């Protein structure tokens, strides 16, 4: 019965992958399919490259789909249809698989009278939403998407695994899209609901590493910096040739320097051609972002145009458009003086975080924190007729 | 409007009750009667059509001029004329309610 | 028509047919009303066609039936807000065209009307309600099918800085292409009207950001010589625009408000509750992470 | 009004909680006024406990 | 004055205004083919369009006697006959003001 | 976790009129003469001094003990720098006239 399907998938595969087929009939027989569940979720790991696992999975998704979780059904499913790269084959196996999930939910709702399987069926629209990214059918995806959005949102009872695949779904679509601010905000959200669980591999975090980088130093409002670098993610692969700038690129920004960001910005337009036609963008962004940190750093909050002009190494008329490109994209509010040559601002949108960024704002307090303490004193001692 | 008989505080808006007679015309439309359909009082429809239905479509002359545009028209004339019924009429080229 | 005495030829039809009927059709009455409005168009007498518009009621074109007129209306409309040079009016009017199901429906018919809408809106001068309207057609997503009409609306619709010499040069080959509003011969000279629009946008937006700039400076700002900005800024405080101080010898000029003693304390008032809102907040904020970590 | 509760701080994942006695009180006020349903629980502080 | 300005005078159905009313009427009742509306409008003379529409009723009475659901041009004949009389008696030619 | 919803107490005028007068002192629901806003005035500063010892402290805390970082208490501090009023400001001689005035 299913002697035929694992012995010939044997021979496909390489050796090394033959007790775990073995291990496939054991606990058929043993009629455990809690060990069942794990071994599966295991097999796409070492045979990434094989599709051996897509026609393994045929079997065992008309079988167990209420005897085992379904959170499991679609964890196994979607590297076998996201690495396919037939996605008409892709569309067409899932469609299937959630009529047979509909059927099934109506009558095993109290029949085991201690499980759900309405939970399934979100999930399955999400991995329909990704084919068709690839597929580049972006707009049949979205409005798919945010369908299923409406769902959600009614139901705070839902796992942790559905808000999972529904960002990682989100963050593709503003990919193809290429909307840097879009990407980055949403990836941050997968960050978050990642789950011990297997549903991550190896490939996929150094992937999500690169495309946040990128994004990052080319959005318009981005100063999200020192919160990457600080991230698990991005401090691991730093040692490899293709992260290595990347991070000292990220790094020369989050700290305003010049003089080890324009040395990397050199290498990158011949290397790179993404790179090659924002280098006007770039050189402003860390102009940019340097001029909010020298004020606001300072407890003066007024400041003359000349030092900001060494600062970002332009001259005056360059000074003024910065301040206003800032203004408009709703990052300061505040005024510009070419009478009284002086930049006032006040509102600033929340800086990076940093040890030393708190140690100013904890030694600012300090200053203020002597004047409630001294006239508290005055008050209490003047004053007779307080209450007489 | 609508208040307690424990604290003699408006708790809540009661929307104003309809009169039945006025509003039963104002729901329905009362039209269309033809111009060719009405026999010797031919003339009178025409008449009303000048008062009323010149200066709608265009206050815009007779503020060229700076004459008021007329309104008011006193129907009369031994019952039975149908002279409500070329209340209808008049309105009914128009379209007006 | 064909004839010269179209002049002879258009007064006929227009005395005549103007009156009322109380036996002929509606369908057959609009469209002798379009001729006659045609006719004062080609003589030259808007002020004729302005009110043979009006005399066929608004309320007749709302209908499927009366659809295909509603195209006609609307077209006829255009050309006599078109020659009084007053903009405002003719973006609406192309707005009922665009709406009309078979323009909307059908992907190469929308195109030049979208574009028309587009271009009057911008020569239209920035009111209150103006920047609703631009924005309508910003959260279009047919104003996203369309690239020279993308880049173009966006500029004005954000507050931002966008010198004159670079509408001047960039946008004179992709524009000129497409008639009636920058390819006519009327209207070859709306081009001048481009300009005006530009530097009124660039006061506006400088006027909320510098509250003090010298005259020197300005000119740059602009890229308009001395006389020519103290005296297109000067204009701007008789349409009641903007108010402003401007000091003749080319000195400063100054874009903000006499004020009151008590008006400036207010933002004071507020900086002063706002401030201890955040210290009241951040009081229990700490005590959850206190205990819980 | 109270519910039966019990707490051990030895291990804050062990607590008592009547499931009977809710029901039971919840039917009872909703006949003194039309106000009164569960819109939450109440904690006796002294802080708020990660428990 | 800026009420009522204009002063619109409605009379009678003339003699060949009085043929159209007839039309109106026999259409919206049943009949089994009338044509004698000719002569019918010269016994008619003077009225109002009310006392048409009471005419056809007045008809309507004759036939149902003689046991028919439609009117026959005989009836038409008595009916406007009958009518006449009341109708001068009855008789209103005023203008109100 | 848990959002902190602020509180000011209320009660119906069915209960507040037994509220009102089985109260029996000054109260800080109510306020009589002079003498009690020069109170009011020592108390509210009296809070404010408390209130900021525990901000530095929690600065100090994060930077020593290394607590985990809050974005949100952080975020929200770093707003109240640039709300905060300065000196030899224009601004301060509109007060003096006021104060004249008053
Ligand atoms: N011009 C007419 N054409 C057809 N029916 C008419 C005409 N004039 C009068 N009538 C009839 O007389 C009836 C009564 O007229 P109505 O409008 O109620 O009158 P008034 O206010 O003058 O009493 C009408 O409903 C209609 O049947
Ligand atoms: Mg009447």
Same mark, same amino acid.
């Given at each position: ?388 | 409007?609508?208040?307690? $008989?424990?604290? %003699? =505080? ?5 929307? +104003? !009750?309809?009169?039945? *007679? ?15 359909? $009405?026999?010797? %009082? =031919? ?5 009303? +059509? !000048?008062?009323?239905? *010149? ?18 028209? %006193? ?23 | ?293 | ?51 | ?97 | ?102």
């Amino acid at each position: 019965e299913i002697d035929t399907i694992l012995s010939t998938l044997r021979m496909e595969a390489d050796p090394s992958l033959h007790p775990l087929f073995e291990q496939f009939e054991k606990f058929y027989e043993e009629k455990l399919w809690f060990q069942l569940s794990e071994s599966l979720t295991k097999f796409f790991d070492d045979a990434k490259s094989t599709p051996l696992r897509l026609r393994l999975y045929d079997n065992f998704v008309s079988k167990f789909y209420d005897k085992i979780n379904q959170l499991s059904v679609v964890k196994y499913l979607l590297a076998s249809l996201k690495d396919s790269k037939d996605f008409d084959e892709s569309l067409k196996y899932l469609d299937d698989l959630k009529a047979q999930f509909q059927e099934l939910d109506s009558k095993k709702q109290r029949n085991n009278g201690s499980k759900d399987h309405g939970d399934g069926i979100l999930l399955i629209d999400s991995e329909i939403a990704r084919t068709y990214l690839l597929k580049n059918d972006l707009v049949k995806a979205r409005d798919l998407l945010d369908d299923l959005e409406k769902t959600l949102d009614k139901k705070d009872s839902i796992p942790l695994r559905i808000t999972n695949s529904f960002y990682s779904t989100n963050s593709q679509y503003f990919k193809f899209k290429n909307d840097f601010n879009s990407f980055y905000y949403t990836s941050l959200l997968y960050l978050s609901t990642l789950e011990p669980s297997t549903s991550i591999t190896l490939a996929e975090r150094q992937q999500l590493a690169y495309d946040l980088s990128i994004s990052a130093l080319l959005g318009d409002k981005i100063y999200n910096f020192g919160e990457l670098l600080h991230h698990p993610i991005m401090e691991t692969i730093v040692n490899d040739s293709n992260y290595d700038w990347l991070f000292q690129l990220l790094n020369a920004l989050t700290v305003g320097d010049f003089d080890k960001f324009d040395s990397l910005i050199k290498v990158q337009i011949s290397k790179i051609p993404i790179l090659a036609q924002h280098e006007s963008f770039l050189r402003q962004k860390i102009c940019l972002m340097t001029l909010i940190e020298t004020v606001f750093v300072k407890n003066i909050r007024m400041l003359s145009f000349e030092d900001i002009s060494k600062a970002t190494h332009l001259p005056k008329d360059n000074v003024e458009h910065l301040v206003m490109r800032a203004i408009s994209l709703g990052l300061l509010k505040g005024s510009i003086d070419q009478v009284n040559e002086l930049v006032t601002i006040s509102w600033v949108q929340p800086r990076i975080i940093s040890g030393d960024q708190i140690t100013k704002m904890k030694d600012r307090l300090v200053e203020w924190n002597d004047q409630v303490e001294k006239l508290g004193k005055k008050m209490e001692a003047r004053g007779q007729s307080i209450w007489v | 409007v609508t208040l307690d $008989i424990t604290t %003699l =505080t408006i708790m809540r808006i009661l929307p +104003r !009750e309809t009169d039945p *007679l006025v509003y039963n015309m104002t729901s329905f439309e009362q039209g269309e009667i033809t111009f060719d359909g $009405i026999g010797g %009082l =031919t003339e009178q429809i025409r008449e009303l +059509r !000048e008062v009323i239905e *010149l200066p709608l479509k265009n206050p815009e002359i007779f503020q060229r001029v700076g004459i008021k545009p007329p309104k008011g028209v %006193l129907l009369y004339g031994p019952p039975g004329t149908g002279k409500t019924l070329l209340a209808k009429a008049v309105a009914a080229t128009i379209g007006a309610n | 028509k064909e004839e010269g005495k179209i002049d002879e030829a258009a007064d006929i039809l227009c005395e005549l047919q103007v009156e009322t009927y109380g036996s002929m059709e509606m369908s057959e009455k609009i469209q002798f009303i379009l001729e006659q409005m045609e006719l004062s168009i080609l003589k030259g007498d808007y002020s004729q066609a302005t009110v043979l518009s009006r005399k066929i009621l608004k309320k007749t074109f709302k209908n499927p039936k009366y659809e295909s007129l509603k195209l006609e209306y609307y077209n006829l409309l255009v050309k006599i807000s078109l020659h009084k040079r007053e903009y405002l009016e003719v973006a609406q009017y192309l707005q009922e065209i665009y709406q009309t199901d078979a323009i909307k429906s059908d992907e190469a018919k929308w195109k030049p009307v979208l574009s028309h809408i587009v271009y009057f809106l911008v020569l239209s001068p920035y009111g209150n309600l103006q920047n609703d309207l631009i924005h309508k057609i910003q959260n279009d997503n047919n104003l996203k099918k369309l690239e020279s009409q993308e880049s173009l609306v966006k500029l004005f619709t954000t507050n931002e800085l966008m010198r004159w010499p670079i509408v001047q040069k960039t946008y004179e080959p992709v524009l000129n292409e497409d008639d009636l509003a920058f390819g006519g011969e009327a209207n070859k000279h709306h081009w001048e009207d481009l300009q005006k629009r530009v530097i009124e946008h660039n006061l506006r937006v400088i006027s909320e950001y510098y509250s003090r700039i010298t005259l020197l400076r300005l000119n740059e700002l602009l890229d308009l010589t001395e006389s020519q900005t103290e005296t297109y800024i000067s204009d701007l405080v008789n349409q009641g625009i903007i108010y402003a101080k401007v000091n003749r010898p080319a000195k400063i000029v100054n874009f903000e408000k006499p004020k009151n003693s008590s008006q400036l304390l207010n933002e004071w008032s507020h900086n002063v509750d706002e401030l201890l809102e955040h210290i009241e907040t951040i009081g229990h904020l700490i005590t959850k992470e206190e205990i819980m970590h | 009004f109270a519910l039966p509760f019990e707490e051990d701080e030895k291990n804050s994942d062990v607590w008592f909680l009547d499931h009977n006695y809710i029901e039971n009180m919840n039917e009872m006020c909703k006949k003194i006024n039309a106000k009164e349903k569960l819109i939450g629980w109440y904690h006796s502080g002294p802080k708020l406990r990660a428990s | 004055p800026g009420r009522l300005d204009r002063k619109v005078e409605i009379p009678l159905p003339n003699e060949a205004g009085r043929l159209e009313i007839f039309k109106i009427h026999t259409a919206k009742v049943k009949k089994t083919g009338e044509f004698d509306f000719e002569a019918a409008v010269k016994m008619s003379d003077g009225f109002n369009g009310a006392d048409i529409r009471n005419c056809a009723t007045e008809a309507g009475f004759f036939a149902i006697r003689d046991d028919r659901d439609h009117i026959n041009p005989d009836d038409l004949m008595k009916a406007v006959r009958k009518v006449a009389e009341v109708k001068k008696l009855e008789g209103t030619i005023e203008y109100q003001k | 976790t848990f959002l902190h919803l602020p509180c000011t107490i209320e009660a119906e005028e069915a209960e507040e009129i037994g509220v009102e007068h089985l109260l029996r002192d000054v109260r800080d629901q109510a306020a009589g003469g002079l003498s009690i806003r020069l109170t009011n005035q020592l108390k509210s500063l009296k809070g404010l001094q408390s209130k900021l010892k525990d901000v530095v402290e929690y600065l100090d805390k994060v930077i020593n003990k290394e607590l985990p970082i809050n974005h949100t208490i952080l975020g929200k501090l770093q707003d109240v720098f640039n709300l905060l009023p300065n000196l030899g400001t224009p601004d301060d001689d509109e007060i003096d006239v006021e104060n004249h005035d008053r």
